[PDB]
Design a protein around this ligand. Structure first.
Ligand code: FAD
Ligand code: FAD
Ligand code: TPP
Ligand code: TPP
Ligand code: TPP
Ligand code: 1IQ
Ligand code: 1IQ
Ligand code: 1IQ
Ligand code: 1IQ
Ligand code: 1IQ
Ligand code: MG
Ligand code: MG
Ligand code: MG
Lengths: 582, 582, 287
């Protein structure tokens, strides 16, 4: 039973009712930046002892940290901001969280009810603005609805297909005194009547049947399986089916396994795309057939029966029409199909060794590779050295760009919730903040943000938060002085014509600019630089052993290119494997 | 005649047609940050020599710099960004520009037409998201509409009541080749039929009549007169009417004048609010009767006939019902009324010396003041010393908070376009970026960003832009280690209970954190610190004389409070004039 | 043309809706509030400061009284045909201007507005902003229930009436003394008019009768009422028009009087769309 701070019949401010509504939801952490419209809320937060508030230096950091918190754990992210400028500063975060289906609850303070529409001071139609970029939102119009709306937001944000839910709370409601009713029922008739029911055996056995009838079965795992790590594992050790995952599904199935095809897609391995290009059966679990994974949909698995299991009906059949589909929780489906494969084991006698070898050939004929030049540090190598020194147990947060794809390719994640990257919206500046969220959600864990000089400088101000909050965040900054992924798309489709991709200072293009070391210095964060591949281990070992937050600026040659690479809309026969800017 | 880069019959990419559409609009400057969806556009920009592109380190800086560019000059601001994360990063800027009625044109790249709604990669319903926070927006659906839509955007953004206009341009359209028609007519039948016509004499003389019938006339000038500096001046030297302006109207009428009542409102002078509280005639020109200016509308000028001249009909009568109103350009109205006051001069024989004295008493009984403690630097004094050393000729950009109100109170702006502050939305982190925009728009001018430690760290990354772009931006950072305006609202209404307003490091709350000096150091920007009020002049003189960008971190005691202060919704009889946190 | 509207006058606009004030015509003086309160207020001032003011507009009133006599509302009578205007006037007369009038939309609508003198508001129920046809009969039902002991008369057009003719069933079943003065001109009057004025009188599907016998009145509105147990009659001669209307009024219960009129009639005066006072048309029809 929840021990309240107020008497069951004692009236208290709405702001207090809100905070208590969060405590009753198990919330222990929020990322809130003060403002006129949310002052009451903040005051109410200080009255709470079960909830720690991590003050960011910019709302965008707040929302991204909330995402980190969410992605790095099972709990949803909770961020709070004031009206107008505060609120609009969360917009990027919500779109990000909506595209990557991330549990999030955003509380924005609003101007008093009567002033809504009057175009008052620091007022913005936040609900209208965030309609198409959130799972659902609300505008509290009665202090008596606070309990119900908060419970409904957390429910919606974490149930079905997880998503961001924003709650606008007018200032005057925050002040209004009242006696909360924590027994009110949720008003979600439509939603509840759309919640998938446990998978039926008729559908599950129909799949197992297709497996036994297949000769080239390939698992296409996505971030929809992040909670089915075990079930998914048991499944593979019962079918011996090669597993290929999306960028979002990394970790679901250990990348360092024998049956692992690693990440597939635009920048996936050549063998991962090969397996899918020639499979006769595609087991698409927890995936949404994104473009950077299929390219030309008519050429995607064109020679295979597609079984698509998804919790979201709308997703099923949207891009690629399945042969067999199952609208439901992938975890339940897995446990089910596992039982059938366990009993009817001998009867089935599944063997895909022939397929596995056909692939094991491509896997050795086109493995992930990187070139080393003189004593320069190869970003890929750096990451590998990190995987090594952290024994693949580190939680990685990332920015967006080349450095992002490498962190995805050269690190072997043991479990999900270990890889926190912006994939659907691909928002730069995600990394550092996300690492903050991860570190708070996982105090006793190695948290490392692998950033790009572009993505990092974008939210560099969160270094202040890292210090003030005493968070052991390790920043492995792969510095290439450019906007890598963009300067790359130039050498590939625009005759290498520099389109404002240089981030250094033209007055001295030989000097590293900005000096990321001094940035950390300003925030009391110990740092170092590495340029020689030779002293790279000592470097990374130091960053890891130095207690507290740390920043390692590891210089890399910009010419590097992320390969393999299947151009936008292309096919497996368009996979590029050679080229750069040397 | 515009000399094109392509033959009148030569087909070129849509992206090229766009850029040429901007050149034909007189655009010389853009603030664009690269992305997949805008690459074609950027490439097209490099083909242009009349347009300089200033690459920011974050889109929000881009849009705020575009605002600075716009506010600091007459031209509109033009910012460009890619889809998804790039685009949502402009949201704050648009709301800001919409609330402070600022000419702005935002070009966001979108995913290919066919992929719209497919929920593709890096895709966002930008048009839907920015509907309620822009003057108007567009989604280009045909490469043949680029010429017309661009011309319509610049028209709408700069005509009537200036505002932000966003243009979404799908990627595939940017690639599509075509032959532009620069003679197409604009499709704005409704808008054109709502454009106010020149003021009628019957209405203008009705005002002049009310002036001669008044004994206590008070001018209530707002940012709607930023282009009527002369007309407004001539008017005063013909009626001798005391002038009080909004935060947005600063500069319209020289603050260092004898007839100047300075800024009125929540933080306006006591005499400015007095004059309005006891005037019998309020000449509201270019104002929108905001809350932080009237408070309780029933008590605002309750004893006076209100003449409201506005270019926006919707604004007239919205908050305060006028006795006489004029929907039209305030500049035209002024020139008109000036002629009448010039001819019927002797006949009228206007004399308000009695009124002016009644006010001149309050002006001396309650002048703007600030206290000095020991050798500590008083933020107000610092600003005054700056006004002095720059001879009131410096363009000031500001953040939001206490430091913002002081920059508004203790500096005497000679003309409009000299004070660039976020007033309607009050977005923090506006300052530095805005100064960048001002410096590019005014190369040979003293540009000084007066920031708060909170507002500054929020977009600190633009220091990289300052350096790389070689901009003589001077940052007078009033460092008080707190969120001043917020910590203030606590000592006033929350018993001084700290609600996460401390920006320093709790581990050593005696040390200045962050070290803003090192931030500039990282970006090759010379800096210094000042703590003693004694060496404050040498300090500021140095910042001004050191060629190039400069950052002066001037330490101030946080306890300071912005006075006078009329609480939210209060009246002239609620004006606070004593209190702080000593 | 808004620029020509009262272009020579100071406009005082009192409205309860702020958005309305200044929307189309910028006022010199405006008052956002209840017009009733404003009136009571201004009345007191005009009552006290009466002698002081000594208001006299006799000169103005005469200047107008000249135009009022130089261009009064008129209508022409042809042979024994019934002039729709006259019919309405005869109704105003027999009902002593105490009848609640509901109307359809079209010529017949403008005439009911011009040739009847309403004593109070809530007596004239017409669709003016949207101008929805078929409003009349139903509206009369609403009026009759809201005013049991009152003379309710729907002045309809053959077009507007047939559109909701089914409510006759409601009239009967509900026992409502609804009187239908149907001005039958066999056409879509207001529309056939806009044709003779701007389209060289080219018939654009405005004929509501049967082409197979364009001399017969179609539909037979009498039989419609017959189907619903509603007593009816027809009038064609201007001579027996009074007896007709008197009967409709005296026959207890609902009643329908189909009064035939020559379609050529035109609603005048008429200022074309967007025109000005100098565009006022006062002569023309389709004879
Ligand atoms: C620079 C850049 C390059 C990229 N390159 C690649 C690349 O080469 N390869 C690649 O894979 N991606 C790449 N991406 C990421 C890519 O855009 C997509 O975000 C990713 O492929 C989506 O993977 P997903 O469908 O598995 O995850 P999501 O998009 O998160 O979709 C998960 C799906 O699982 C469903 N689901 C959720 N929970 C459950 C449950 N309990 N039971 C059943 N179903 C559930 C959802 O409703 C949904 O349909 C790139 C992104 C960037 C920024
Ligand atoms: C911390 C903080 C404190 C604040 N404190 C104060 C304070 O104490 N006092 C104060 O004044 N403000 C204060 N503000 C600013 C305040 O919120 C409003 O932005 C400001 O009062 C608006 O002034 P304005 O109406 O003159 O300008 P705007 O809001 O820009 O409105 C201009 C008006 O002029 C009209 N107009 C435009 N062009 C023309 C033309 N050519 N001809 C005729 N009409 C035209 C517009 O359409 C509009 O109605 C504060 C803001 C912050 C962030
Ligand atoms: C907020 C935002 N702005 C612009 C983009 C466009 N973009 C897509 S990939 C990429 C790569 C560059 O960044 P960097 O951090 O330096 O890393 P690198 O790719 O060089 O490793 C960019 C700029 C984006 N995704 N998000
Ligand atoms: C983006 C954003 N976040 C939060 C607020 C709420 N807020 C309003 S005034 C204020 C004052 C504090 O900042 P600082 O820059 O340190 O200056 P000071 O007031 O101390 O001079 C704040 C945080 C805002 N206006 N914009
Ligand atoms: C429901 C509907 N359909 C069409 C119109 C277009 N319209 C406008 S005035 C008019 C006049 C014709 O009707 P009628 O009832 O015969 O009367 P008359 O004008 O002939 O007296 C018409 C058809 C309308 N206002 N409403
Ligand atoms: C798991 C189900 C319940 C899922 C996919 N279905 C909805 C969902 N539920 C809805 C319920 C009522 C009305 C509109 C809806 C729209 C959606 C939607 O697709 O966004 N939300 C979800 O998470
Ligand atoms: C940001 C968008 C505009 C970006 C990265 N996206 C595409 C893109 N363009 C495509 C064009 C045709 C068919 C499939 C595509 C898939 C993608 C994709 O990778 O999402 N092209 C681009 O430049
Ligand atoms: C100066 C006039 C033209 C002004 C105030 N009026 C509009 C304006 N013009 C419009 C024209 C057509 C349809 C809706 C509109 C809404 C507005 C509005 O108030 O936002 N825009 C302006 O700048
Ligand atoms: C951000 C909002 C919520 C902020 C600054 N705004 C008010 C506020 N509250 C008011 C409440 C009643 C009457 C007039 C007000 C005017 C304001 C105003 O100054 O704009 N109170 C606040 O806390
Ligand atoms: C149903 C509409 C389209 C109708 C009756 N309305 C007009 C019309 N057109 C106008 C065209 C220009 C200026 C003023 C007008 C006023 C009207 C009006 O009477 O409302 N023209 C028409 O045909
Ligand atoms: Mg980089
Ligand atoms: Mg400060
Ligand atoms: Mg008719």
């Amino acid at each position: 039973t929840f021990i309240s701070r107020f008497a069951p019949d004692q009236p208290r401010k709405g702001a207090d009712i809100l905070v208590e509504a969060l405590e009753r939801q198990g919330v222990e952490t929020v990322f809130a930046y003060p403002g006129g419209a949310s002052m009451e809320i903040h005051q109410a937060l200080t009255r709470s002892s079960s909830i720690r508030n991590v003050l960011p230096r910019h709302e965008q950091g707040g929302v991204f940290a909330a995402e980190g918190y969410a992605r790095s754990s099972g709990k949803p992210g909770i961020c709070i901001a004031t009206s107008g400028p505060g609120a609009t500063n969360l917009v990027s975060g919500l779109a990000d969280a909506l595209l990557d289906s991330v549990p999030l609850v955003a509380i924005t303070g609003q101007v008093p009810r009567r002033m809504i529409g009057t175009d008052a001071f620091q007022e913005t139609p936040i609900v209208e603005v965030t309609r198409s970029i959130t799972k659902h939102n609300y505008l509290v119009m009665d202090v008596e609805d606070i309990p119900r709306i908060i419970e409904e937001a957390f429910f919606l944000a974490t149930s079905g297909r997880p998503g961001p839910v924003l709650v606008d709370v007018p200032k005057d409601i925050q002040q209004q005194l009242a006696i909360p009713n924590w027994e009110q029922a949720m008003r979600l008739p439509g939603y509840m009547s759309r919640m998938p029911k446990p998978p039926e055996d008729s559908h599950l056995e129909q799949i197992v049947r297709l497996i036994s009838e297949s000769k080239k079965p390939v698992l296409y795992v996505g971030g929809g399986c992040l909670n089915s790590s075990d079930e998914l594992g048991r499944f593979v050790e019962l079918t011996g089916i090669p597993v290929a995952s999306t960028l979002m599904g990394l970790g679901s199935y250990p990348c360092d396994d024998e049956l692992s095809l690693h990440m597939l897609g635009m920048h996936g391995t050549v063998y991962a795309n090969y397996a899918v290009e020639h499979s006769d059966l595609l087991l698409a679990f927890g995936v949404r057939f994104d473009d950077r994974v299929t390219g030309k949909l008519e050429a995607f698995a064109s020679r295979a029966k597609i079984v698509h299991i998804d919790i979201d009906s709308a997703e099923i059949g949207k891009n690629k029409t399945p042969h067999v589909s199952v609208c439901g929780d992938v975890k339940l489906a897995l446990q089910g199909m596992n039982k059938v494969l366990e009993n009817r084991a001998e009867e089935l006698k599944l063997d895909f060794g022939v397929w596995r070898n056909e692939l094991n050939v491509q896997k050795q004929k086109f493995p992930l590779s990187f070139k080393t030049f003189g004593e320069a540090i190869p970003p890929q190598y750096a990451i590998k050295v990190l995987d090594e020194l952290t024994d693949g147990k580190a939680i990685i947060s990332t920015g967006v760009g080349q450095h992002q794809m490498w962190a995805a390719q050269f690190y072997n994640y043991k479990k999900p919730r270990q890889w926190l990257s912006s994939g659907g919206l691909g928002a730069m500046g995600f990394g550092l903040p996300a690492a903050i969220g991860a570190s708070v959600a996982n105090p006793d864990a190695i948290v490392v943000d692998i950033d790009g000089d572009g993505s990092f400088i974008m939210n560099v101000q969160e270094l202040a938060t890292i210090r003030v909050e005493n968070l052991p965040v390790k920043v492995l900054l792969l510095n290439n002085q450019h906007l890598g992924m963009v300067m790359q798309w130039e050498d590939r489709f625009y005759k290498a014509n520099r389109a404002h991709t240089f981030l250094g200072d033209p007055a001295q293009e030989d000097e590293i600019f900005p000096n990321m070391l001094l940035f950390a210095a300003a925030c009391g964060i110990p740092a170092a630089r590495v340029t020689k591949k030779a002293d790279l281990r000592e470097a990374i070992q130091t960053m890891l052993d130095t207690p507290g937050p740390y920043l390692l600026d590891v210089i890399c040659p910009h010419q590097e290119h992320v390969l393999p690479m299947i151009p936008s809309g292309g096919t497996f026969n368009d996979v590029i494997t050679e080229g750069d800017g040397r």
